[PDB]
RNA sequence: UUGACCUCAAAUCAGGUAGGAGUACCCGCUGAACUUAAGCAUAUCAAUAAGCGGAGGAAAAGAAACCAACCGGGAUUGCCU
RNA sequence: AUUGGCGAGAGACCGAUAGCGAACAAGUACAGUGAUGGAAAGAUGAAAAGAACUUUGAAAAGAGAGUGAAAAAGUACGUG
RNA sequence: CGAAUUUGGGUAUAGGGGCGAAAGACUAAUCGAACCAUCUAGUAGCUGGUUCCUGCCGAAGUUUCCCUCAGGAUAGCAGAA
RNA sequence: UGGAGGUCAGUGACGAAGCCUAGACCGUAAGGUCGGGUCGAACGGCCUCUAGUGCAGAUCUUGGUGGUAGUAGCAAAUAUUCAAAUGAGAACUUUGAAGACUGAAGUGGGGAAAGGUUCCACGUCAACAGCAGUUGGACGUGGGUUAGUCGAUCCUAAGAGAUGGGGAAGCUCCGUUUCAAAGGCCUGAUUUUAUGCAGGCCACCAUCGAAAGGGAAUCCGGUUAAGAUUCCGGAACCUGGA
RNA sequence: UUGUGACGGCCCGUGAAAAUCCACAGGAAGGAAUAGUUUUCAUGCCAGGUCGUACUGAUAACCGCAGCAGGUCUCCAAGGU
RNA sequence: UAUCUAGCGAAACCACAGCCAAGGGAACGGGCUUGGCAGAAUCAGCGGGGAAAGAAGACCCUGUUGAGCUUGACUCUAGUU
RNA sequence: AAACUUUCAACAACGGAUCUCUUGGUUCUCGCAUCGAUGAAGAACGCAGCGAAAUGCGAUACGUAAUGUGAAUUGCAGAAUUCCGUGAAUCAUCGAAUCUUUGAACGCACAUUGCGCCCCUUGGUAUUCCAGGGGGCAUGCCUGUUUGAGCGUCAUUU
């Protein structure tokens, strides 16, 4: 909130052949006489500085949330929608895909991969594995360095 | 004659170095420092001088004793070896 | 002035000691970007005004 | 000619030179150098030779 | 009263603030008495005070103080609560009886302004409370 | 490397004083040699050795004074603990744990009971 | 005359203790004006900024000289209202 | 409660005229008697391998040569 | 141009204050109220600027009230749904 | 256009981004796509989300650059010249000669404030000395300031300023002998115990404040690259002690 | 030119203080003889610490943004006209 | 001095620029219209023009913008009684 | 018709945009409570084998102890068998110390590295003077100790 305002700059007024923006006083600095306190000014405050009381979370009706969840569940059982979503389910016998509770009881990653191979989700797995690519911007140094697809959801 | 000829006449320091802060802010005739308020017990400080507080505050110097207090507290103010 | 005080003379000594250029070997020190003394002083250029 | 502790006076310098080099001194002069350190000219008595004491100390 | 300490009565503002003479200090004569006493005897803690005498010019008070470093007070839990640091300069923070009276710390509808603290209440009812999902 | 504090700790008062004296003499001689020689890193080691001798002497003296004042109150201020100004002004464990006889009687009569809601 | 007592002193007497920092939050005192009122003086800004004194890890408040008018609730604090 | 202190974890934030004034010997350099004011300034290359040697110049330096993936990277160094 | 003289150093007076053989003069190139930081991003019916393209529609300077006359409200004119 | 969720198991060190290119294509346009050069590590299409999202102007901000322009100009303080030396190089450096000037309220010899090493020597000319430079108050490296007698230190001046005390919410204000119980100074006690005490005298108002006021005392000759009333030789003086 | 002396003029102006040193009044106290007193007579013994000290002081060492025709206190002062 | 040469080397200002006559036009054009005309590159001067440059007119008016000063303005106030 | 003005391209300049990078910032959340007369925060001056500097430290001075790890530090130099080890290190940890002159700052003073006094010790034929070493001497207030003062005042005498 104090960015761009930690100066005592005052406008010189008219009659000095310079614009009327506030200017830093003093001397012998290289910064004295320079513009301050403006969005157009280097080192000044930005226009309408970003505030933390901006609305971040947005409320949704519980019923509309449940409507969207039901629609997504129903879409998970549409064969064409899954392919359009791009999920490599061509080799799967039929969807929705239901597996015994022994999968709930599974224990190791090797046998989880084996189960995926058995039921046909492995193709989705290789899609996610071979989709790993660097992000295309300044999101790399914001702890978002890599991007990859979404695989199967085991429910 | 208020400009250059008058600037020719200034050779008498009104401020010398202050004992509490070495700032050349000690007024000789007023016997008080214009920066830290020496010889007053309280160091001179103002809530409109935020930059001045930045320049003169804890952590600006060596902190010859306060820097180890966090370590001693973390270890529980222990005596022994 | 000729008639100085010891405080002023001590500041003079400190200034004279500080006024020297970079030792050559700090330049060769690794991860070093210092190339010269940027706090160098000349008696005509800048007054320390103590 | 010695570099001397800045807190040392002529009495202390005389006593230290006498205790350190087993020599009697005649006079001590001191000056604070422009680099801020004390410099002492200690004149010994005629019974002693500064050159011999210097080459005893190590510097010819 | 407490004459406004401005020079020549010039207040440099609105006529509402131009008053100099009949202005009244918001703390009690008891409060300033125990404040001065505590500042003099800065090693004790002001336990209480009371009125003894008054003439035209002065009011006279007697201030009870307790030594927090005396071992007769430090032990004997009857009075060693005063030896904890949170009671440093009760007379200065307004924690004595006169201090509470002048602050207005009392239960009821007549003290809605100053019950939990005047400035604390003002802050609480002048803050803008925004939640994550805006209400 | 220089001298070692553990072997310095076995020496007595006169031994440590003698070692300090000739270490100081050797430092003086090394300073003279440094006046003429380009670089003289042995002077650092000798200065460190003098520091070692001095800290061992000071530790012995402080332990002797601690033994002298052992058992009695009013330790010398540099010998008593150095926690914190507030940590020293604070009431001790005994002084804080002090409680009146009325509250003690109430506490013994009615201590917070240990109970569970199941049946 | 010899001993108290009361009040007041002195001591490089014995032992302590206060000051000063930092002050985001906290407890008070003091205290504007710009500003809004399309002028402006009450009002507003604001019992805010600046100024002063005082704490803690929180502070403050706190076990009713309360609320209420009900088939009554029951220290304080904070949130929603 | 908490834009201070000490530890941590994070972000649909900024990306060297931005973000703190300060990514750098930054509250530094230096301006003012003083209160105070207050910057600019990041990037060779993976590794200095930072150019031996010859030649022309008083020298700076050039021309060759050489190192290097690159000298259309030569410290006045990424791109330009 | 021997004095109501000139001048060094010390010292006193500090901002609605000082000091003035008086000019609103001087008070650090600042004076019909110094300078510094803050309130403060003070307010402005006033001046200036206001950043891509194409498509369709497309004005008003008039009514009433206003310390109203360089400005608003209202009705009109206009777009969109 | 920056960033975000999905997707193209998208492009890429066999060359991403960026930049340059009177080269091509597409769109009315905003713009998109591609050929070539440069470069060296990331980036894009699509469906959506989001915003610190698009500049020609604001005497806009910061930085950079022009024409003017090799232009105005470098003209106050009488003035320089000849020859050697050094040097790559001399109008400007050194030396010699000549001509001059300051003309003793100096362009001389010293100091006060201020400066702070500018002093002196050696080396050296990238920058600085608005021409030049071999020179320099520049740059690099070093050397140098020696006191009983000179000052400060001591005194008090105008004044400043604790204490006692009184104001003030308070930061602090007044006050300086005031409505104070305000100390140090002579000689014996003087080693059954000390510096105690039945020894004695008194009763100042703290303190700071002058490197030109007041004050204890040093002169000559010689000596250094640079210090000297300070070192040395000689010759004295004062203060305090025994 | 400087110092000194004895004088004279001027003032409704008559032109610092203190430290410090000495002296006088008084007479406390003490004092003989192979030795007392005199350390204000002469001679003789010891010590004298701390800090400054270089250089410029200006048409180039200070201030004026600079090596700025400006400003900035003072001592010495040859011959002729 | 200007001038020419060696060295050194800025600034103001600048939409784009730089020949006129008349016309019309924001009623005094360098540009537009119609005529006159019109030949590289330039040097020293000069002061007619560029309504030349220097400064968001300091006169005047407007603003529900100030400030200094005054008073039997309105509203208060230190002091005093 | 070169010279010259202008336009464009290539190469070279000037400048430092763009792109990519990031040991920095900013915002949110979580946890904790610890400055100082036992001398803080801050200041000054010093300390490294070669350092001038937002480093670290204090005449024990880029640090000493103690502990842990286990062979470095490194720009150059270097003590130089310190390497199957009470043991390298610009390491980490950190509980013992040192901690100059100051600073609320404390004998008085402070534009002075000025001036005292007190107590021990050592020298100068010395309780007194001088010098050196060590240790001290602030203010307010509290509790107590001792020494006092006051016809304020109570008992014990002509």
CSV table of C-alpha atoms (C1' of nucleotides) in Angstrom, one decimal, chain J residues 76-77 104-105 108-115 118 129 136-137 144-148 150-152 155-157 210 212-214 227-228 238-242, chain K residues 16-21 39 44-63 66-67 69 72-79:
chain,number,residue,atom,x,y,z
J,76,A,C1',39.3,41.1,-18.2
J,77,A,C1',43.9,40.8,-14.7
J,104,A,C1',56.6,46.0,0.9
J,105,A,C1',47.6,47.8,2.9
J,108,G,C1',56.6,38.5,-0.8
J,109,G,C1',57.0,35.9,4.5
J,110,G,C1',53.3,33.8,8.1
J,111,G,C1',48.8,32.7,10.5
J,112,A,C1',42.8,32.6,12.2
J,113,A,C1',38.0,29.9,10.2
J,114,A,C1',37.6,26.2,6.8
J,115,G,C1',39.9,22.0,4.2
J,118,U,C1',46.2,19.0,-0.9
J,129,A,C1',43.9,20.7,-15.8
J,136,G,C1',50.4,19.0,-11.9
J,137,G,C1',46.9,20.3,-5.9
J,144,G,C1',56.4,12.8,6.8
J,145,U,C1',53.7,16.4,12.0
J,146,U,C1',58.7,14.7,18.0
J,147,A,C1',57.1,20.3,23.4
J,148,G,C1',57.5,20.9,31.3
J,150,C,C1',53.8,27.4,21.7
J,151,G,C1',48.5,26.4,22.4
J,152,A,C1',44.5,23.5,24.4
J,155,C,C1',39.7,31.3,34.9
J,156,U,C1',35.7,33.9,34.3
J,157,A,C1',32.5,37.4,30.3
J,210,A,C1',37.3,32.5,24.9
J,212,A,C1',41.9,37.1,19.6
J,213,G,C1',40.0,38.3,26.8
J,214,G,C1',43.0,36.8,31.8
J,227,G,C1',58.9,18.5,11.4
J,228,A,C1',61.0,21.9,14.5
J,238,C,C1',59.0,27.9,35.8
J,239,U,C1',55.9,24.5,38.7
J,240,G,C1',55.4,20.5,42.1
J,241,G,C1',58.2,17.4,45.2
J,242,A,C1',61.5,15.6,48.8
K,16,A,C1',34.9,43.6,32.2
K,17,A,C1',35.1,39.7,35.5
K,18,A,C1',37.3,35.7,37.8
K,19,A,C1',41.1,32.4,38.6
K,20,U,C1',45.7,33.4,40.5
K,21,C,C1',50.0,35.6,43.0
K,39,U,C1',64.3,25.3,52.0
K,44,G,C1',72.7,20.9,45.5
K,45,C,C1',68.6,16.2,44.0
K,46,C,C1',63.9,14.3,41.1
K,47,A,C1',59.8,14.8,37.8
K,48,G,C1',56.8,17.4,34.5
K,49,G,C1',51.4,13.5,31.7
K,50,U,C1',47.2,14.0,27.6
K,51,C,C1',45.6,16.2,22.7
K,52,G,C1',47.1,19.8,18.3
K,53,U,C1',51.6,20.7,15.5
K,54,A,C1',52.6,18.6,7.9
K,55,C,C1',50.5,22.1,4.1
K,56,U,C1',47.1,26.0,1.6
K,57,G,C1',44.9,30.1,3.6
K,58,A,C1',43.2,31.6,-1.9
K,59,U,C1',42.5,34.8,-9.8
K,60,A,C1',44.0,26.4,-8.0
K,61,A,C1',44.2,23.6,-1.4
K,62,C,C1',37.9,27.6,2.1
K,63,C,C1',32.4,28.8,0.4
K,66,A,C1',34.3,24.3,-10.9
K,67,G,C1',41.2,24.9,-10.7
K,69,A,C1',37.2,38.1,-12.5
K,72,U,C1',36.3,35.5,3.4
K,73,C,C1',39.7,37.9,9.9
K,74,U,C1',44.9,39.5,10.8
K,75,C,C1',50.8,40.5,11.7
K,76,C,C1',55.8,42.4,9.2
K,77,A,C1',56.3,46.5,5.3
K,78,A,C1',63.0,48.8,1.6
K,79,G,C1',64.6,53.5,-2.3
